[PDB]
Design a protein around this ligand. Structure first.
Ligand SMILES: [Cl-]
Ligand SMILES: [Cl-]
Length: 310
């Protein structure tokens, strides 16, 4: 089993607007010794399940404004924390975090919970990984909500999904510098910078998972994986492009955080074209990379969009 540590539960005692009860999956296949946290909100017997996938350097806390909206519509909501994040266990070595390590966790979670009629909800790494899941088990997936996200293919195949890595200087380049360089990385300060509408208490909730740097190996590895894509990642991601263009026939809703310096219009208009049936995006002028901080609007508008296309 992988060398991992667990955030003390007391770190979550004081949390702003996170009343969602914990659920855990221990020793998923491929993950012996590791406990994963997920939220499971709303009617457990609902036909529709909103699978809400977070990215870097967040956790299911990022979905706290969306979850109630989805639950109130009568749906079930599943919001897992990746290993390395949130209330999930945290491998201590960066080498144990890979694209497929995270991808296969999600596949194992879906199978363990037997999730069907899924509305996949993604942003950042939740999309880099989550957008590669439906082709593995297509009958489980019904709809997509895509916020600022793309596919980790090679630069020749989709230059838009690599150009952001090097320009602008104050985009991904700055993001990565902020995450991988400090010896004492403070995620509250990071999140106040990259999500400037957060309150102090909200920003503190993003620090809560990480008592010290030993808990942050998954946080450090994610931006390294955007800059350095292994062959498995490239191949899976390129296969997913074909899925979305040729195989997907589900209902789709896109929302763009227009202030994002990473995965804004430059990436999202190319993604819209690649996803068969994707409608014109909802542009959220004041939202940045962390579109879910404006997520009440995304959730409500997505539901309205799905109701009018049922
Ligand atoms: Cl923000
Ligand atoms: Cl990243």
């Amino acid at each position: 089993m992988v060398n991992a540590i667990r955030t003390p539960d007391q770190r979550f005692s004081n949390l702003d607007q996170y009343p969602f009860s914990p659920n855990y999956l221990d020793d998923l296949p491929g993950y012996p010794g590791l406990r994963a946290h997920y939220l499971d909100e709303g009617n457990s017997d609902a036909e529709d399940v909103f699978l809400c996938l977070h990215g870097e350097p967040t956790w299911s806390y990022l979905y706290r404004k969306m979850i109630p909206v989805f639950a109130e519509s009568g749906a079930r909501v599943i919001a897992p924390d990746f290993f390395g994040f949130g209330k999930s266990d945290k491998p201590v070595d960066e080498e144990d975090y890979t694209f497929e390590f995270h991808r296969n966790f999600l596949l194992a979670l879906i199978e363990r919970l037997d999730l069907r009629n899924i509305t996949l909800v993604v942003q950042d790494w939740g999309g880099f990984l989550g957008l590669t899941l439906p082709m593995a088990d297509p009958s489980r997936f019904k709809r997509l909500i895509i916020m600022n996200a793309c596919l980790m293919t090679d630069p020749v195949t989709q230059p838009a999904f690599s150009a952001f890595v090097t320009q602008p200087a104050d985009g991904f380049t700055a993001w990565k510098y902020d995450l991988v360089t400090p010896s004492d990385l403070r995620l509250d300060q990071f999140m106040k910078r990259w999500a400037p509408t957060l309150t102090e208490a909200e920003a503190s909730a993003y620090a809560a998972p990480f008592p010290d740097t030993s808990y942050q190996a998954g946080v450090r590895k994610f931006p390294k994986m955007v800059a350095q894509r292994d062959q498995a990642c490239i191949d899976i991601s390129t296969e997913a492009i074909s899925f979305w263009q040729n195989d997907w026939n589900g209902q789709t809703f896109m929302a763009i955080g227009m202030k994002d310096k990473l995965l804004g219009p430059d990436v999202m208009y190319p993604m819209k074209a690649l996803i068969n049936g994707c409608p014109e995006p909802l542009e959220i002028a004041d939202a940045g990379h962390f579109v879910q901080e404006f997520g009440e609007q995304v959730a409500r508008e997505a539901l309205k969009h799905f109701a009018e296309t049922e």
